[PDB]
Design an enzyme around this catalytic site. Structure first.
Site, mmCIF file in Angstrom:
data_model
loop_
_atom_site.group_PDB
_atom_site.id
_atom_site.type_symbol
_atom_site.label_atom_id
_atom_site.label_comp_id
_atom_site.label_asym_id
_atom_site.label_seq_id
_atom_site.Cartn_x
_atom_site.Cartn_y
_atom_site.Cartn_z
ATOM 1 N N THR F 1 0.909 -1.253 -0.025
ATOM 2 C CA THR F 1 -0.023 -0.046 0.113
ATOM 3 C C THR F 1 0.812 1.155 -0.006
ATOM 4 O O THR F 1 2.054 1.178 0.636
ATOM 5 C CB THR F 1 -0.952 -0.017 1.184
ATOM 6 N N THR F 2 0.354 2.352 -0.649
ATOM 7 C CA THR F 2 0.868 3.710 -0.493
ATOM 8 C C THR F 2 0.014 4.705 0.003
ATOM 9 O O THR F 2 -1.373 4.483 -0.620
ATOM 10 C CB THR F 2 1.135 4.094 -1.771
#
Lengths: 213, 123, 215, 222, 200, 202, 204, 197, 202, 196
Positions: F1-2
């Site tokens: 995830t970012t």
């Protein structure tokens, strides 16, 4: 980390008769919880009078089949005669024990007419211990199959029943039925059933459907 | 290694090196062996008595094992080699089979050694 | 390769009337990093054969040079005999099994696809040496995701057209791009046929993403 | 195990296989993996079967109390929150992967709950060993605002794909349709595979089995 | 497995069950554990069946070569030592092998017990196997050097029977062999079921 | 995830990808990691989904009770402090990285970063998750003081697109939110709308 | 596995207005049999029976605890437990120890108290209930006895045919495993009577 | 490492045990008594991990004698067996499992002689004859061979002597002396120690 | 370590950091990672310094012998292939990430990336080492077709500076080399010469 | 663990050993002999791992007898001890170490009686008396108490019997019978087994 073995599944069965032998197997190849293919016969015609069935690690199965084919050709070239079923079995025992310390993970059954014309079935451990038997079931569903074979073919734990000699039709029906049950309650088995009948005339192939999962 | 055929067949099919080695045997000191019912005897001819030799060192009758003995003619050094090789074979045979070596067996070993040298390369 | 380093994801293949098609995303991934995003994981072994790879790309390049030299040697002999797809598949099965037996496995999982003698070949090889033929093949997570679609379509209709097969593999590749982490948008389709092997350039999945306005 | 769910135009359709495997032997067929939580909320279960059964039963009882007290039908979000909080407290040691589906005053809601307490509201979800194949079918053929028959066909196709392709799954297919108006729980909706006919009869005649001893104790029927 | 062998005045008896198992599953109930190495001496199987079969067959060919070369049949002691030296090369490589090499020679009736560990020992009574512990007691109570041939048959058969009764991994049929100066004879093969009928 | 947040004058822009994964399988490709803790306080969630969801709901509960009993809009620093206390006390058992961003009248737009281990830092821009590694350079070079709201939105979109293409765990659609005194404007960028950058293309 | 330590086999089967429940008799420590008279089927009612296979200690313990709960139930509620209710009680008992489980695989077989409709079910280690209309099996030899049941069983069997089928299946199944055997006992439950027979089996 | 043997009969139960208590290799005690009388007509034989044996045996003994004092009649052998089994089984799950292997022998006026067997996992089984320890593997076949349900007590002591001299012949450990006693309707009777010099 | 190379028309620009770390202690703060393999062929060395140095000297030995035998300037494909054969044959023993770059008459500037495990791929630009992670985004965003030598040098300098700032294992001075038909032009950026980007202010 | 004991004297060395062989919990053989006659006037008592004992002992035996055959005289006990020590130490670091504990006894016309001790690590030590096995721990102290360098051979046999009686009393394992042999200038003389 790397494991040289995987269990690709499959079941193999063989029955012997006075003038016949049967070798039969499922046609499902599956790694883990996934089917690889629904038509991979586990049974191979070594010669006119003999069939071999193999179950376990499919890479070892392929390698061992190729080895036996080459060694059979070698024996024919050297001795000017085709190998007998018992000779094939002894050679297979030697081949399997050759890699005792990195074993083939394969369960083998040899089914063929013997020199006298009788049916003969030889069953192999992975490490090469071989035993002649009237019938045998090998592979994933061996435990499922063999009790009914012992009861019906062997007339074990039955009293006041006449020991009829087994016939080709009766053995055929029993093979189809036991494989139907093993398809019913074994996950690895069930795609289809290939039955190879070995008799004086030769090998004959019969294929019947089985339950897709 | 020195790989060469010292021994080869000749016209009329004779191994000249083997025949010459038998000639070398003929030159050597006499030996005589007589089998007997409860005894077996060996005798050998002292080539000469130097009057300074120690009798112990020059003996030609040697024990390959407790149960078997040998005497020889021909080259003494070669005799010593085969004697030592036969002795070690006697001990190895006893080790492997838990029984004393028989005379036929040790004779066959010595014969096989000699025959190997008659056919092997560079010997 | 005891440990894979730069890896490739699923390869797919399906046999169609008069040929075979295979497809693979142009990506090599280094531990969840899309490090190398323009690499070809499909090989043209000869006129009648294709080879596609998943797993360690280094081992695939090694098998590329070895197998390329083999086919070149056959061409040098020029005796009118050429390796078949079954033959190349068999040799690859041997090589992978031997390297497995020595415990220095080639990490790849392979799809060999070809069309020779008016017959289509589509065969699988695994790092352990497991090998088989099937009407449709898939590797890696393709086995879990795409192979159901291919199997349903083929079971309903055993024989397919080139157009149907191309639409099918593109559909499966869209599914893989949706649901596979190690996948990439750009991919190449290679088709073996009577004419020969033809590998198309980078192609796009054409996704939807309409679900986002839900939730 | 394959369990799957989809939201159609006016409700939900839930689907599951009917096979229970202990190891690699099929311990059971015709197993029910679609559970009752409430009249308007049903939930499929996968993972550890006992964990799925017991957690679904517990949440069913708690929602029965909640609905009785509040006097209005239970909401799906309440079921989701109860489930996720219990699962999070147990830190995944209770092993359950759940597809939660129900209709309520807000509308149709489908939730997917993982063993560790994660939840995801989606239009379509799959869980179990066959989740990947079922999701392949869904990713291919799902469209928004489907009709009930179309959704039933899609869910049946997905569960069938899980059945044939995955070893752990395989038996009859179950469907459940929850709408605002009605509920139709469909134990076997389809029977994709059947056992073959037994060619040879092995029925053991009387006297086949020896008996060392016997004791007949009469029961006082009354 | 349970195997049993002892020496008495009229030669050597060898007895064994016929069960082979893989874990709990009984793969075979009719294996011939007694191996007919040659007409004049015979061996038994315990531990790994493949190991025992392969190595004893190799011993058989070596014995035949020795017979051809030396024009005399190998002594039981010498054959036991050949087997021991053969297996010692592979010590620590996972061989599990238990053997009782039985025969006659110039010495007399000879019984040797060879093991993968390396022990080779001569004795009047030996038993190797999972049920050997149960077999040993009944054999020890019954055994005497002055024993009738029928009495020794009865002792060996009942010993293997009781061992099968107690031990899980030993069962099937009690094969029995009697070594006589001419050579071995396969005296009986009784199923433990009919033996259960007989003894009880 | 970012996950990525950036502070513009008078508010914040939050951004996150939609991909959550189990191994190499994308279990949900449309996840929403931007959650409302309060009307003008959001959290970007990275790390274990279960841990982040639990802690987010707990902080929402506590901050709502605090806000009603104080009869005042809650402070972003207060929300971040609650997040810190939870994550630090359970740092051994918890695997979460949170970016707390929002608007409060006292201190304007604020961005707070709670990495794993339970520490609180205020940052002009913050990036978190697996994919933030790949875009540290892009944010360091690209960031300029006093960006506008639309400029910050484009900046966040470009950064998240780069991280998404270069990270397998990251992917899906870009979910973007702009929180200010006026209110929350949430948008999703999908397909062609997502910024795209050229490939080497030999 | 720990389940294989003592070893056992339990089976139940459903006929027409009848049930049969059968189990081996061996008690042994990993390989050495101790007794050929172990009770693995216990009565939980007039025409309801439970069969436990697994660890002998947990067999006896869950049997005793279940009888405790059942006797209190029968006294409090003044009726005999229904089979499904006994299933649910056993499942609750086993799931109470979901961590540190009782190592058993129970089988319930009986007739409904009033309808006399036959009921067979099995439960896993941690109380997963499975109700079947044909047969249920548990123990070390589940594989063998599953295949044998799948072949031999037929619907709507008579009591005598049910006894023959269950007897053949147990005998042939326990013949092909090491750790179970030493005789088998078959209980036949009919509305009017209970018939218990001990079969003749290989003592190996 | 410690040997227990029990033979039931028509009107008696015979029990014997080795008299060795040992350190690593040194045999600290030659006359250790592993038999505990719970009551007038019941004995408990215990072998197992050190400490656990004496602790568990004493606990069960004192509980049984408390039953006697409170209620005025002795426990049945079967009831005592089930009670000690319950205590052992409860501890198995707990952090303090008593690693003990027991043989309980008793006579009941109503139910006659009884011999009971339980392992460290707390299974219980009534048996005609039974043994514990590594020597049991050697000696059980003797009992299975020569035992009869109608065996007289002289025949039983003879059979026991055969079983023990087999241990003397073959078992690796040295168990030179054994204690013997019979329970009958009269009560526990000590018998002369079977001592193999 | 951070290494990178970028191809321009008629040549290549190579770049690397100058820090070698043993644990968390900088053993050499002025190391040269741009080794020469031939007059127009260079290798950027990342990974274990021992392994990279060993394979570099082996390859320059082989390539020099090859070039004198053929009497033509060596090909960068030849250099990359030699590196690849060594690394693949000994992939288990040695860990090394190498970017091979140079100029040939026939092919012009070429850049090849030989990561760990011994695959070989030509690239318009390449980045390697621990610090390459943090500048993937910057190089993906800013790279443009048709960049000049000066523009490529600036791009290399900015990227290596960002990586050096954000990565502990990379630091020191930037060593830059431009290889073309004319020859090598090695330069070093020290201190203020290194490009700098503003730290976040708060 | 098997028991070996040796007691040197003025003009003799006494050696004794237990006669059992064991598999797991059972003594397979009661008359197993652990003394090897390497020549007329030396014995090698051998205990250790299964197989290694007999293999190593027979190797030393063949080499010593080969020395006798080729040279016409026997190795001295000290030379034989150093030879077996050399062969054992050489294999300690090899792929095939012999886990074998030795007690070598001999007589020489020049150097008189000699008893030697070797461990599985192949450290050689001459001793007035020595023992091997777990029983050595019990029995050595009795030897320390009652041994004198001028002990007569009858007294030495009595001391041996004392030590074996202590083994019967205390040592857990069953060692019912013990071989006894004595080496003197005349040769190896077998004596009646001490038995209980």
């Amino acid at each position: 980390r790397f494991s040289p073995y995987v269990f690709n599944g499959g079941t193999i069965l063989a029955i012997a008769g006075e003038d016949f032998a049967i070798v039969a197997s499922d046609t499902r190849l599956s790694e883990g919880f996934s089917i690889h293919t629904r038509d991979s016969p586990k049974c191979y015609k070594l010669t006119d009078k003999t069939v071999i069935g193999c179950s376990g690690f499919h890479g070892d199965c392929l390698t061992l089949t190729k080895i036996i084919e080459a060694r059979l050709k070698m024996y024919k070239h050297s001795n000017n005669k085709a190998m007998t079923t018992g000779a094939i079995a002894a050679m297979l025992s030697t081949i399997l024990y050759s890699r005792r310390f990195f074993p083939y993970y394969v369960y083998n059954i040899i089914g063929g007419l013997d020199e006298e014309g009788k049916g003969a079935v030889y069953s192999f451990d992975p490490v090469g211990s071989y035993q002649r038997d009237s019938f045998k079931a090998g592979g994933s569903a061996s435990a499922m199959l063999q009790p009914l074979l012992d009861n019906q073919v062997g007339f074990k734990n039955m009293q006041n029943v006449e020991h009829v000699p087994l016939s080709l039709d009766r053995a055929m029906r029993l093979v189809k039925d036991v494989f139907i049950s093993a398809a019913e309650r074994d996950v690895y088995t069930g795609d289809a059933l290939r039955i190879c009948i070995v008799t004086k005339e030769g090998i004959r192939e019969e294929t019947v459907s089985l339950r897709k999962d | 290694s020195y790989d060469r055929a010292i021994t080869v067949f000749s016209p009329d099919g004779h191994l000249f090196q083997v025949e010459y080695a038998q000639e070398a045997v003929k030159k050597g000191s006499t030996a005589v062996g007589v089998r007997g019912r409860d005894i077996v005897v060996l005798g050998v001819e002292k080539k000469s008595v130097a009057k300074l030799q120690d009798e112990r060192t020059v003996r030609k009758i040697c024990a390959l094992d407790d149960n078997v003995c040998m005497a020889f003619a021909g080259l003494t050094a070669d005799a010593r080699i085969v004697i030592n090789r036969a002795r070690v074979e006697c001990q190895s045979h006893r080790l492997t089979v838990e029984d004393p070596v028989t005379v036929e067996y040790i004779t066959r070993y010595i014969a096989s050694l000699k025959q190997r040298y008659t056919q092997s390369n560079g010997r | 390769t005891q440990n894979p380093m730069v890896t490739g994801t699923s390869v797919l293949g399906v046999k169609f009337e008069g040929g075979v098609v295979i497809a693979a995303d142009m990506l090599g991934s280094y531990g969840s990093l899309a490090r190398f995003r323009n690499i070809s994981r499909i090989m043209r072994v000869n006129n009648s054969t294709m080879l596609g790879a998943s797993g360690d790309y280094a081992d695939f390049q090694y098998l590329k040079q070895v197998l390329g030299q083999m086919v070149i040697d056959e061409e040098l002999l020029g005796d009118g005999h050429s390796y078949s797809p079954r033959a190349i598949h068999s040799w690859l099965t041997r090589a992978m099994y031997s390297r497995r037996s020595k415990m220095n496995p080639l990490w790849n999982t392979m799809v060999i696809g070809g069309y020779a003698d008016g017959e289509s070949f589509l065969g699988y090889v695994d790092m352990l040496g497991v090998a088989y033929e099937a009407p449709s093949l898939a590797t890696g997570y393709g086995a879990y995701l795409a192979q159901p679609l291919l199997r349903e379509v083929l079971e309903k209709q055993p024989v397919l057209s080139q157009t149907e097969a191309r639409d099918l593999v593109e559909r499966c590749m869209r599914v893989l791009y949706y649901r596979d982490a190690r996948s990439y948008n750009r991919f190449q389709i290679a088709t073996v046929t009577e004419k020969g092997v033809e590998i198309e350039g980078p192609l796009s999945t054409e996704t939807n993403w309409d679900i986002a306005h839900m939730i | 195990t394959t369990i799957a769910g989809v939201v159609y135009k006016d409700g939900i359709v839930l689907g599951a296989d009917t096979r229970a495997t202990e190891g690699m032997v099929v311990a059971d067929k015709n197993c029910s993996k679609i559970h009752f939580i409430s009249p308007n909320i049903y939930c499929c279960g996968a993972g550890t079967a006992a964990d799925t059964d017991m957690t679904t039963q517990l949440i069913s009882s708690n929602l029965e109390l909640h609905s009785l007290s509040t006097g209005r039908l239970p909401r799906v979000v309440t079921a989701n929150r109860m489930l996720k909080q219990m699962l999070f407290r147990y830190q995944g040691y209770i092993g359950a992967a759940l597809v939660l589906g129900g209709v309520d005053v807000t509308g149709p809601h489908l939730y997917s709950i993982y063993p560790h307490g994660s939840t995801d509201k989606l239009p379509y979800v799959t869980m179990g060993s066959g989740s990947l194949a079922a999701m392949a079918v869904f990713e291919d053929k799902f469209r928004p605002d489907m009709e009930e028959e179309e959704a039933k066909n899609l869910v049946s196709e997905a569960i069938a794909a899980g059945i044939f392709n995955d070893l752990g799954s395989g038996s009859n297919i179950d469907l459940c349709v929850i709408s605002k108006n009605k509920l139709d729980f469909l134990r076997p909706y389809t029977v994709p595979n059947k056992k073959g006919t037994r060619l040879g009869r092995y029925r053991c005649e009387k006297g086949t089995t020896a008996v060392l001893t016997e004791k007949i104790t009469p029961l006082e029927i009354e | 497995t349970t195997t049993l062998a002892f020496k008495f005045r009229h030669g050597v008896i060898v007895a064994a069950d016929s069960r082979a198992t893989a874990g709990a599953y009984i793969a075979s109930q009719t294996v011939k554990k007694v191996i007919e190495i040659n007409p004049y001496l015979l061996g038994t199987m315990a531990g790994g069946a493949a190991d025992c079969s392969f190595w004893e067959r190799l011993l058989a060919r070596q014995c035949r070569i020795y017979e051809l070369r030396n024009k005399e049949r190998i002594s039981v002691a010498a054959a036991s030592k050949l087997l021991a030296n053969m297996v010692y090369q592979y010590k620590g490589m996972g061989l599990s092998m238990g053997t009782m090499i039985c025969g006659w020679d110039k010495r007399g009736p000879g019984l040797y017990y060879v093991d993968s560990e390396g022990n080779r020992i001569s004795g009047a009574t030996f038993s190797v196997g999972s049920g050997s512990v149960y077999a040993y007691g009944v054999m020890d109570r019954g055994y005497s050097y002055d024993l009738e041939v029928e009495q020794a048959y009865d002792l060996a058969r009942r010993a293997i029977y009781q061992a099968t009764y107690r031990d899980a991994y030993s069962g099937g049929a009690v094969n029995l062999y009697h070594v006589r100066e001419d050579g071995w004879i396969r005296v009986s093969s009784d199923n433990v079921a009919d033996l259960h009928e007989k003894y009880s | 995830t970012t996950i990525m947040a950036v502070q513009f004058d008078g508010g914040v822009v939050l951004g996150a990808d939609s991909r959550t994964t189990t191994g190499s399988y994308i279990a949900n490709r449309v996840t929403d990691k931007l959650t409302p803790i309060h009307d003008r306080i959001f959290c970007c969630r990275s790390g274990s989904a279960a841990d982040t969801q639990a802690v987010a709901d707990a902080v929402t509960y506590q901050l709502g009770f605090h806000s009603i009993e104080l009869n005042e809009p809650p402070l972003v620093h207060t929300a971040a402090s609650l997040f810190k206390e939870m994550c630090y006390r359970y740092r051994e058992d918890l695997m979460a990285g949170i970016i707390i961003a929002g608007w409060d009248p006292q201190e304007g737009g604020q961005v707070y970063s709670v990495p794993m281990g339970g520490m609180m830092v205020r940052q002009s821009f913050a990036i978190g998750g697996s994919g933030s590694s790949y875009i540290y350079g892009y944010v360091d070079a690209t960031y300029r003081e006093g960006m506008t709201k639309e400029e910050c939105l484009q900046f966040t979109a470009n950064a998240l697109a780069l991280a998404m293409e270069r990270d397998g765990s990251s992917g899906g659609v870009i979910r973007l939110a702009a929180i200010a005194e006026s209110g929350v404007e949430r948008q999703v960028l999908l397909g062609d709308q997502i910024p795209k950058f050229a490939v080497a293309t030999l | 596995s720990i389940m294989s330590y003592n070893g056992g086999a339990v089976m139940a089967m459903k006929g027409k207005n009848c049930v049969a429940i059968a189990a081996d008799r061996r008690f042994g420590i990993q390989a050495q049999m101790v007794t050929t008279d172990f009770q693995k089927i216990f009565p939980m009612g007039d025409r309801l029976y439970i069969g436990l296979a697994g660890l002998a200690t947990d067999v006896q313990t869950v049997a005793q605890r279940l009888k405790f709960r059942l006797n209190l139930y029968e006294l409090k509620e003044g009726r005999q437990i229904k089979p499904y209710t006994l299933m649910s009680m056993v499942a609750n008992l086993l799931y109470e120890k979901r961590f540190g489980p009782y190592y058993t695989e129970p089988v319930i077989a009986g007739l409904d108290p009033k309808t006399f409709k036959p009921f067979i079910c099995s439960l896993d280690l941690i109380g997963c209930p499975m109700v079947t209309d044909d047969f249920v099996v548990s123990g070390t030899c589940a594989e063998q006895m599953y295949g044998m049941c799948e072949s031999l069983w037929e619907p709507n069997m008579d009591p005598d045919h049910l006894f023959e089928t269950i007897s053949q299946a147990m005998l042939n199944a326990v013949d092909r495993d090491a750790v179970s055997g030493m005789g088998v006992i078959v209980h036949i439950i009919e509305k009017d009577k209970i018939t218990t027979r001990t079969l003749k089996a290989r003592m190996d | 490492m410690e040997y227990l043997i029990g033979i039931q009969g028509p009107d008696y139960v015979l029990v014997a045990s080795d008299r060795v208590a040992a350190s690593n290799i040194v045999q600290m005690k030659d006359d250790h008594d592993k038999m505990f009388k719970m009551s007038e007509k019941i004995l408990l034989l215990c072998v197992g991990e050190a400490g656990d044996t004496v602790q568990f045996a004493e606990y069960i003994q004192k509980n049984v004698q408390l039953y006697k004092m409170r209620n005025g009649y002795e426990l049945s052998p079967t009831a005592a067996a089930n009670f000690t089994r319950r205590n052992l089984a409860d501890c198995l799950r707990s952090r303090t499992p008593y690693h003990v292997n027991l043989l309980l022998a008793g006579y009941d006026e109503h139910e006659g002689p009884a011999l009971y067997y339980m392992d460290y996992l707390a299974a219980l089984a009534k048996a005609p004859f039974a043994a514990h320890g590594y020597g049991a593997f050697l000696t059980l076949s003797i009992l299975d061979r020569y035992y009869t349900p109608t065996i007289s007590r002289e025949r039983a002591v003879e059979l026991l002597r055969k079983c023990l001299e087999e241990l003397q012949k073959r078992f690796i450990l040295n168990l030179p002396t054994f204690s013997v006693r019979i329970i009958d309707k009269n009560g526990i009777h000590d018998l002369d120690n079977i001592s193999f010099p």
